[PDB]
């Protein structure tokens, strides 16, 4: 039944504080161990801490004690806190669930939990000290846009409009040291992009 | 209507809620997040652990009981059929496991009106499984109180003023204290209870134990059932 | 803090096959060991914990075996429900510790990148100069792209995508980054690959 409801974030800039929820549907928070958990991408997993059922904190030392997990019962939320943020800190967020530990109903004892069983489909924060900016578009035998120096990452190529229809092959972004990405999408014309948030196409 | 996903709309619930005294237990009912924890504190400690109590000795023999059942050790009243004109919302009924009993006529019908109707019931007569229906019964006044009935629960002997009525199993009191005897609802030991949804609502005070798997045994067949102990 | 390792870091498998992944920790862990499947843009998934118990819903392909320092992930039949990245976690001590993952991919014959290239635009070096270097339908993800204006480093990045399900293939980008440009007029790009036994170099001159 349990679920978990992550929502998302917004543009971040170093040194900013970083708070995300998540929403427990289908059940209470009681009794439970919850946690958080991030993804770099393209790299993998790492385990930010915990809360207990009675809202005792662990924290991981990674974090230099500028991280902040609590659990808001009145709304049924948890939620994550993380100042002095730096473009590092560039990650999915995913909020987990303890598997509930097996209980010996005569000894009275368990194995303290630390498998994540229920997980909320995570949450892109990027993190990045530049300000939004826009697509810069540019262009034998028997082509492509290399658009670049975007602020935001949700960006889309499609070539001749919806007559991309198959056997075409789309590239993941890139940053640069200009702290501004950039991406490339090849063609087996002219293409349109969708950077929604530039309002830039 | 008015719709929250579930667990407690049904047209066999009985909605027969007076918060008059604006006491909040509605937003309970409505969503199970939400619980009352204040008092805990003073309640709990008039609940005393098992060891405290005398130890048992010689038969079982059953007994009949109080106001309030947030102890492991309240002696539950034995279940009979009470008017839904008494109920507020679900009403849980423990195999050992969490089930939910709905409105009915006099005559095991069932009935689909909210407990409007005179005739609407919760029959909640119980026998003690595996030859039987349920351990007991919990559910809501329609003040906001939480209600339990159950049993008959246990005698297992003893003297002094210490002496110990088991609800539960507590095999440690006496050998022949066990859950399939003597037990008379939601307490499976004297330390766990079985988790249901509106468990936060009706025993307010377990709102930070920690939920486990649990396993037992009645009459020689496995449950395997989620129950919070702290 | 407890180092959790893991081997191989990808594995290149076929339906039918029993493919057994071990995962390796700095200090013994005990049983406290728990497997997960991560599928791309998806959650972690929960499949073993205590290094044999497999938690619900999971299929019996998945077996868990191991203690102490060592411990290992079975599927004893692949199926196409079985391709992902695969997670070690310990729960011996905090701060809880993952395993870098392990790639499980689809199997194809060995195929050879279709490279192409392709040169700045002049409204670039008008506005920096940007070289671009293409890999297409190349089979397996293991290839090497190197620039070289007559050796380059600290001016490439490069992507890949995911394996195409209707060719189990994978494709790569390259990208090189005015006056540097216009110093040295012939540019190459050279691609190393299993299916090339030829490696191959792709020029240009301004
Ligand atoms: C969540 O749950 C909690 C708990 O269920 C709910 O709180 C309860 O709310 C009800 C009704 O809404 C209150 O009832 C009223 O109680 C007061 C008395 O309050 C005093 O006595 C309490 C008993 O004290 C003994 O027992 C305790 C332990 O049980 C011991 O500790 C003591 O030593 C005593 O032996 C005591 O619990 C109260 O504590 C209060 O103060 C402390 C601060 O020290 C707080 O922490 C507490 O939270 C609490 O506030 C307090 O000491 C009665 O007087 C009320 O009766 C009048 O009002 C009625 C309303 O209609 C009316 O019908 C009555 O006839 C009566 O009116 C008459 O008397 C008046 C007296 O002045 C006259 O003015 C008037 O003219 C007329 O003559 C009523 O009985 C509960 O106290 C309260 N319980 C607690 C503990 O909070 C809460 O509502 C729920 N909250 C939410 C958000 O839903
Ligand atoms: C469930 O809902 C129903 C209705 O839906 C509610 O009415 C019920 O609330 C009521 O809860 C109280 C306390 O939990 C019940 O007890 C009552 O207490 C009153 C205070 O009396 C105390 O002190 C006196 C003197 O010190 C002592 O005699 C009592 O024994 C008690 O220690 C008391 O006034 C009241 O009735 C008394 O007077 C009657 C004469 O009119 C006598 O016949 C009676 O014997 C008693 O002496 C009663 O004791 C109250 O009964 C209960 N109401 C009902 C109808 O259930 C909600 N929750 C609960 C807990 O059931
Ligand atoms: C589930 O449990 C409940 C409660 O324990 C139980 O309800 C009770 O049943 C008894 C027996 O039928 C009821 O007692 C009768 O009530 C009627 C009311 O009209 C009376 O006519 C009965 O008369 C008795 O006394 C007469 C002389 O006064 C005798 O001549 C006659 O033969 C009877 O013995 C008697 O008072 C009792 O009222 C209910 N109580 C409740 C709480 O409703 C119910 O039957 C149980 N259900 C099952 C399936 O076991
Ligand atoms: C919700 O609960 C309130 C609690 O205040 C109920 O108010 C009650 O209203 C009735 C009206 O019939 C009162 O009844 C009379 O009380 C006098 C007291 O002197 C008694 O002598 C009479 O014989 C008669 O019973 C009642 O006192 C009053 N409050 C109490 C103490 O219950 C209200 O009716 C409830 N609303 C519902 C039914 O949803
Ligand atoms: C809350 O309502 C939603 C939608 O009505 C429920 O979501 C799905 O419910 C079905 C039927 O039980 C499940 O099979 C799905 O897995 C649920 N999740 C998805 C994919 O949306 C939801 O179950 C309700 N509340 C709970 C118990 O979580
Ligand atoms: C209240 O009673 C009515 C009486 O029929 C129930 O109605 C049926 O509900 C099911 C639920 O999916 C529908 O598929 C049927 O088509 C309904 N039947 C007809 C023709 O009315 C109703 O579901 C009951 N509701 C609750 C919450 O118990
Ligand atoms: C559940 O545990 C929390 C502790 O995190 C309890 O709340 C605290 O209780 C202590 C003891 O009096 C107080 O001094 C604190 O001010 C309380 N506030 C918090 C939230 O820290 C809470 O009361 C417990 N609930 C129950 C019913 O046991
Ligand atoms: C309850 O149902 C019975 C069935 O005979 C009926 O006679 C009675 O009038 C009904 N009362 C209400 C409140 O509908
Ligand atoms: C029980 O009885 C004993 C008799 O010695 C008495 O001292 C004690 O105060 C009473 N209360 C308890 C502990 O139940």
Redesign the interface.
């Known amino acids: 039944q349990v679920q978990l409801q992550q929502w998302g974030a917004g543009l971040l800039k170093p040194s900013e504080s970083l708070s995300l929820t998540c929403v427990?549907?289908g059940?209470?928070?009681?009794?439970?161990?919850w946690?958080w958990?991030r993804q770099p991408p393209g790299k993998?997993?790492?385990?930010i801490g915990?809360i207990?059922?009675?809202?005792s904190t662990?924290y991981?030392?990674?974090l230099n004690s500028r991280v902040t997990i609590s659990v808001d019962?009145?709304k049924?939320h948890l939620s994550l806190k993380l100042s002095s943020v730096t473009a590092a800190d560039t990650a999915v967020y995913?909020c987990?669930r303890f598997?509930?530990?097996?209980?010996?109903?005569?000894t009275?004892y368990?194995?303290?939990?630390?498998?994540?069983?229920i997980?909320?489909?995570?949450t892109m924060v990027t993190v990045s000290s530049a300000s939004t900016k826009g697509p810069?578009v540019?262009?034998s035998g028997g082509?492509?846009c290399?658009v670049?120096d975007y602020f935001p990452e949700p960006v889309t190529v499609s070539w001749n409009s919806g007559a991309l229809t198959s056997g075409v092959?789309?590239?993941?972004?890139?940053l640069?040291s200009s702290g501004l990405y950039?991406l490339?999408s090849?063609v087996?014309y002219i293409c349109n992009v969708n950077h929604k948030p530039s309002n830039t196409k | 209507l008015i719709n929250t996903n579930g667990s407690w709309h049904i047209n066999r619930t009985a909605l027969n809620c007076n918060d008059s005294l604006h006491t909040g237990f509605l937003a309970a009912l409505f969503y199970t997040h939400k619980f009352n924890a204040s008092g805990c504190p003073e309640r709990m400690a008039h609940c005393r652990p098992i060891d405290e109590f005398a130890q048992g000795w010689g038969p079982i023999t059953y007994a009949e009981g109080d106001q309030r059942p947030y102890c492991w050790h309240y002696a539950p009243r034995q279940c009979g059929t009470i008017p839904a004109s008494q109920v507020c919302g679900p009403v849980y009924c423990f195999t050992p496991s969490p089930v939910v009993v709905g409105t009915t006529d006099r005559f095991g019908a069932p009935t689909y009106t909210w407990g409007e109707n005179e005739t609407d019931v919760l029959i909640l007569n119980n026998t003690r499984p595996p030859q039987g229906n349920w351990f007991g019964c919990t559910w809501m006044n329609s003040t906001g109180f939480t209600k339990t009935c159950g049993g008959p629960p246990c005698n297992i002997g003893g003297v002094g003023n210490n002496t110990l009525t088991c609800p539960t199993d507590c095999f440690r009191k006496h050998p022949e204290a066990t859950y399939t005897k003597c037990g008379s609802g939601p307490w499976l030991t004297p330390r766990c209870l079985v988790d249901y949804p509106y468990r936060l609502w009706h025993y307010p005070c377990t709102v930070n134990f920690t939920i486990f798997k649990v396993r037992m045994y009645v009459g020689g067949v496995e449950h395997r059932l989620n129950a919070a102990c702290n | 803090d407890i180092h959790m390792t893991q081997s191989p870091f990808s594995l290149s498998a076929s339906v039918g096959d029993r493919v057994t992944i071990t995962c390796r920790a700095s200090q013994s862990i005990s049983g406290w060991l728990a497997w997960y499947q991560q599928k791309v843009g998806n959650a972690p998934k929960l499949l073993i914990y205590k290094a044999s118990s497999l938690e619900s819903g999971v299929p019996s392909r998945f077996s868990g075996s191991g203690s102490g320092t060592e411990f290992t992930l079975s599927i004893s039949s692949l199926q196409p429900d079985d391709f992902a990245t695969y997670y070690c976690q310990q729960y011996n001590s905090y701060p809880f510790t993952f395993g870098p993952g392990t790639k499980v991919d689809m199997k194809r014959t060995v195929a050879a990148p279709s490279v192409f290239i392709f040169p700045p635009s002049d409204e670039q070096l008008k506005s920096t100069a940007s070289v671009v270097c293409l890999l297409n339908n190349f089979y397996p993800r293991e290839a090497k792209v190197q620039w070289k204006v007559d050796l380059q480093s600290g001016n490439s990045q490069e992507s890949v995508t995911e394996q195409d399900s209707k060719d189990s293939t994978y494709s790569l980008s390259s990208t090189l980054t005015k006056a540097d440009y216009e110093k040295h007029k012939v540019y190459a790009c050279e691609v190393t690959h299993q299916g090339l036994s030829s490696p191959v170099t792709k020029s240009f001159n301004r």
């Open positions: 427990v549907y059940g209470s928070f009681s009794g439970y161990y946690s958990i993998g997993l790492e385990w915990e207990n059922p009675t809202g662990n991981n030392p990674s019962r009145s049924n995913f987990a598997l509930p530990p097996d209980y010996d109903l005569l009275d368990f194995d303290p939990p630390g498998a994540f069983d997980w909320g489909q995570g810069s540019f262009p082509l492509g290399l670049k092959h789309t590239f993941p972004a890139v640069q950039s490339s090849v087996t």
